[PDB]
Amino acid sequence: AQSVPYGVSQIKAPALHSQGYCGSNVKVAVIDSGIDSSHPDLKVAGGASFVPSETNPFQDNNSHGTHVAGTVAALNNSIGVLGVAPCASLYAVKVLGADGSGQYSWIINGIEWAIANNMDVINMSLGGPSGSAALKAAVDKAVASGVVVVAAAGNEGTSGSSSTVGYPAKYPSVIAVGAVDSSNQRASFSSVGPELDVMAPGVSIQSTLPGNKYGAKSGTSMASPHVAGAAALILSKHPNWTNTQVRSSLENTTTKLGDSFYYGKGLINVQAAAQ
């Protein structure tokens, strides 16, 4: 039987599902450690690998990319879990290797690929403490090209009064996502700062794992795909909205939590965001 992860319900996705909105024809790129395309609960449409030693984007030797992807789009069937936008066209853009790290040149190559291939939404569940003119340029171009770019804020917790949001999440053109629990409390690990935009469920998130498995993971990596999946539902309902309108709708209809430095605008509510 299929189980709906708490997080899907928390952001109110099922309401859209009920209306017949599930992300059909929205192209979402998971820029991460690849997606196990053999998983029975996922449907990968395409993708590319930018990791020199791991040329197949459909082999995930880490498990991270597959987990992120099931949050976005685990199929609606009688098995496993359920994604935020279960009918989306899922693309595996492999930029992290088996050890979960990757070079900036690879990540950037992957963003460039996503622009060229007309992805609607990009999910980046990754981040580093330092930026680069090339990294900024690539996210900026995606957004100028009409792509919704979503990134995990980071897992750096609090540090005095400084921002601990990593890159590319720190860039204004990107939506930086922090993590809450099932009670709406900020996860202690969730990165903080003025660049934080929204929150999403990121503690003990059940999703798909390679080799027809399921398991839980915690991190702002798990929070970001709820937002990416949410932008896919919105576009399925309003195919003519610009990335700008999608973003404003998500930000403008959150459930407000505590201070914006810790919670940004609050927890997204896709039901409200979809109008």
Residues labelled as active-site residues: 32, 64, 221
Which amino acid makes up residue 38? Answer: S
Q: Does 224 participate in binding Na ion (rule CB under 5 A)?
A: no
Q: Considering the complex, state which of residue 174 and residue 192 has its C-beta at the smaller distance from Na ion.
A: 174
Which amino acid makes up residue 98? Answer: A
Pairing of strands 89-94, 27-32: parallel
For residue 95, what are its two tokens? 């930029």
81, 122, 174, 199: which one binds Na ion (CB under 5 A): 174
The alpha carbon of 118 is separated from its chain's Cα centroid by a whole number of angstroms, namely 17
Q: Least Å distance between CB 153 and Na ion?
A: 9
Q: Does 195 participate in binding Ca ion (rule CB under 5 A)?
A: yes
- Tell me, by CB under 5 A, how many residues bind Ca ion: 9
Alpha-helix runs per DSSP H in the chain = 6-10, 13-19, 64-73, 104-116, 133-144, 220-237, 243-252, 260-263, 270-274
Q: Does 176 participate in binding Na ion (rule CB under 5 A)?
A: yes
Q: Does 139 participate in binding Na ion (rule CB under 5 A)?
A: no
Binding window for Ca ion (CB under 5 A); candidates: 178-186, 195-203, 226-234, 254-262: 195-203
10, 29, 31, 41: which one binds Ca ion (CB under 5 A): 41
84, 113, 197, 232: which one binds Ca ion (CB under 5 A): 197
Q: Does 80 participate in binding Ca ion (rule CB under 5 A)?
A: yes
Q: Does 156 participate in binding Na ion (rule CB under 5 A)?
A: no
- Residue list 180-209, contact with Na ion (CB under 5 A): 195
Q: Does 143 participate in binding Na ion (rule CB under 5 A)?
A: no
- SS3 at position 52: coil
Q: Least Å distance between CB 171 and Na ion?
A: 5
Q: Does 115 participate in binding Na ion (rule CB under 5 A)?
A: no
Q: Considering the complex, state which of residue 3 and residue 248 has its C-beta at the smaller distance from Na ion.
A: 248
Per this entry, what is the length of the chain? Answer: 275
Q: Does 212 participate in binding Ca ion (rule CB under 5 A)?
A: no
The alpha carbon of 239 is separated from its chain's Cα centroid by a whole number of angstroms, namely 19
Q: Does 149 participate in binding Na ion (rule CB under 5 A)?
A: no
Around 83, how many Cα atoms within 13 Å sit in the side-chain half-sphere? 35
Q: Least Å distance between CB 142 and Ca ion?
A: 15
Q: Does 147 participate in binding Na ion (rule CB under 5 A)?
A: no
List the end-to-end C-alpha distance of the chain, in Å, as a whole number.
31
Beta bridge partners of 44: 90
Nearest alpha carbon to residue 26 among 173, 146, 177:
146
- Residue list 1-40, contact with Ca ion (CB under 5 A): 2
Q: Least Å distance between CB 98 and Ca ion?
A: 26
The answer to whether the beta carbons of residues 208 and 67 sit under 8 Å apart is yes
- Tell me, by CB under 5 A, how many residues bind Na ion: 3
Q: Considering the complex, state which of residue 198 and residue 222 has its C-beta at the smaller distance from Ca ion.
A: 198
Long-range CB contacts for residues 241-246, cutoff 8 Å, separation at least 24? 242/146, 243/143, 243/146, 243/147, 243/148, 243/149, 246/148
The alpha carbon of 194 is separated from its chain's Cα centroid by a whole number of angstroms, namely 20
Binding site for Ca ion (CB under 5 A): 2, 41, 75, 77, 79-80, 176, 195, 197
